[PDB]
Write a protein that binds this ligand. Sequence first.
Ligand SMILES: Cc1ccnc2c1NC(=O)c1cccnc1N2C1CC1
Ligand SMILES: [Mg+2]
Lengths: 394, 523
Amino acid sequence: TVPVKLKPGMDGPKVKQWPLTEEKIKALVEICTEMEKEGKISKIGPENPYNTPVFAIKKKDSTKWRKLVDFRELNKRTQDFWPHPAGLEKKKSVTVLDVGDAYFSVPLDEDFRKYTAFTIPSINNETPGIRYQYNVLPQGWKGSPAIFQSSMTKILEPFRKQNPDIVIYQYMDDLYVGSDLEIGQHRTKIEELRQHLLRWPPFELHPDKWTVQPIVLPEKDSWTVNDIQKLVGKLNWASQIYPGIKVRQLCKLLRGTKALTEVIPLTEEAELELAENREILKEPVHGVYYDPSKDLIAEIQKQGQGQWTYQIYQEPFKNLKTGKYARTNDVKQLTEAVQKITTESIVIWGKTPKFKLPIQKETWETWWTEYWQATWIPEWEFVNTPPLVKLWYQ
Amino acid sequence: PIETVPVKLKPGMDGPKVKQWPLTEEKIKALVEICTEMEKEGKISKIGPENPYNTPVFAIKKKDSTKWRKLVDFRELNKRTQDFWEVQLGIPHPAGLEKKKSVTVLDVGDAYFSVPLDEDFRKYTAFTIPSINNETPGIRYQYNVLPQGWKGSPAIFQSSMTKILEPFRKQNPDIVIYQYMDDLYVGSDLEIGQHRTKIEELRQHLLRWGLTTPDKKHQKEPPFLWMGYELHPDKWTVQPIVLPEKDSWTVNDIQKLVGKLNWASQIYPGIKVRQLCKLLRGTKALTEVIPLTEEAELELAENREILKEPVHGVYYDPSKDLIAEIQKQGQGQWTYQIYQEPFKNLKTGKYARMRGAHTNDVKQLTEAVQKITTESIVIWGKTPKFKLPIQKETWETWWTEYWQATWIPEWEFVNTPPLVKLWYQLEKEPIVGAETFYVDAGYVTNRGRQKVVTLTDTTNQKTELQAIYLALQDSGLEVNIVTDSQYALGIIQAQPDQSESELVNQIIEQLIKKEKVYLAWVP
Ligand SMILES: Cc1ccnc2c1NC(=O)c1cccnc1N2C1CC1
Ligand SMILES: [Mg+2]
């Protein structure tokens, strides 16, 4: 085992466990009861004051439950360990594989196990609740992938030299296998992997198509005072980014106090300005690169009608990406989107971003696990998106 | 014997070294008696002059007796001792229990004093008993079992108990046991005699570990009063609440009454404190007497009546679905009931939480639904099917116009006034032929009209809503309003129906009147 430690000075996590449904609890019991039999985990005693919340999510294309342990706090308190494929996103199509079970065959430094304590609560606090800690490398922990790195190269060695046509990237419990081969000749080399892996794992992304939704301006037959006003307001907001945007000429049609619905013919001078403003918006602003030293932020907006919008930046307005997601219920969608964005974020930069979700914390904390499927959990906070902003997207 | 839990002092820190304060020869004797007995029984052990650690101890007299009782002040040791797994924070709610035929409660005497202490820690539990002779040194002991007053006792005791109960619970899956501090509640559906018999089995099983308990003649009988409730094996309620009968009320009395009234609302529907609570406005002292307004008197009277006849909560029948029903019982006031059997409440309640300065009934209702949902998962580990006074059409509409996401489990409309609705809606497109008002403390319209007024005791954004307000007043049934206030925009766009701000309310009032209103924003 490897002597792991928390970042200097730091102690272990003591995260409250969000109440669970009788269903999820029963599942977690059947599971932990079993991991206990196989020595992966062990019941702990009162001398352990640490805690990490545990949840149960269902696997996609599987009737079985998966134990999702939210080691977010613990991962922050863990020490750092001392390479992302510049072309994984370039690749035509990538598949994602869960190799979390790889860890369940490697011990966890004895003096560190205390820090992985977690609890299976009981309905209405009628019983004290089952307490365990890990003996093997736990799925979801920052240290597992790291500590298992060696053993992982020693195993991806053959496929890597055998098939140097496919790029393989690992991220925590997941494996991103990319290539440009035919989708049939792909889904194959993938199963050829699931086999070279069983020799020691359940589940296409196509990072090729991932596009940056530009800002758009209404193309109207006729233009009313209102239309122009929405136009100017939006443009003005965007002049913050693309300073070449002018509205001087558009504001001229808006002098006086006309009737909102009054149709306005657009002056020659003005129609030539809009076109320039349109051209400028066709592509993302220049000189905005990804700083590895900065957190990735991801904001979402409910557009309505089952349509959402996101943007990934580090500095305000300086967007690294922008997208849109479309169809359930509001919550299901938002969770599916978060994941979709997290994956992409991983695929492109190798780090999950920090989301700013438009929903009450209690509502989210309540249903998010009903549709979550990823093995990781991004960081997130809850916000109250303004109107104007939402209007300026999609 | 039970397993020993490994204790350690907090990092870096060292054991306590508190000098023993002086003790009357009288107390000295009594202690030497108490401690000599403890050393005979193995709970403590005479130690050597090598141990530097010390904890102060003193004697206390127990009601009824010439005898004294020993008390050890483990504060410092407590400060220097590690943190343990939080002794049960959450308690069950009567409504989550399933009825039993018989329920027996048992007190565990010799609680801590019957559980081993980690050998490496015993050296910190050192205390000294001063001798009466001046030349003679007083005796020093240490603990061998969990000490009363020590930090890790509550948790390590429960830990042990749970382990001790393991087998018995397995051999008896038909018996339910809830552990609470030194008490133990045991229910079963066995026949009277069989139940009493099992109790005796448990009693002996626990005693096999030195844990003593009361025999049938000495056990407390139902209903058991617990955490403010009055529990039967078949039904539950809050313990009898009596309402003061007087003509002089202080702020203290009113606050206590309101507090008492809230407690009851979880079983007694119809309880209201809106008027009593009002009596609290501007109060200067806790002893200030506030006359009961005519409405507060009427309120107290209805609650008093509601509380005259007891009502009981039935227990959870896991075979049946949970049904939840919400009612709007006044502006910002809601009431809900949770039952399985048509109208036999497992529990009730009232939500009055306004999240944010402005809001509408839909938001509020929805938040009430979320609050209830969370509550149920906690008590019954499942969410109830809801009965709501809102129509799907209405809800759905507001849903898709709102920028925030939200969900509502299975729910059916219940035509039970008042039905929640939206009192108004902003046109999606500007109104043709409807005058256009441009506001910026005044306004100007395309039809030539205008008006300007000055305002005092006004905040910046307050004047902003004023403009919009004036415009609504002066406009006709249909009106287009243009503003540069992102602030006012949001507020109104949110389509609130209630607010703290009077101004907002008037605006809402205006808004409800109009046929068509279109609001626009401009930088
Ligand atoms: C205080 C408490 C907490 C949790 N459950 C119970 C109790 N007490 C009871 O009196 C009770 C009453 C009816 C059914 N179960 C009950 N019991 C269960 C143990 C039989
Ligand atoms: Mg203006």
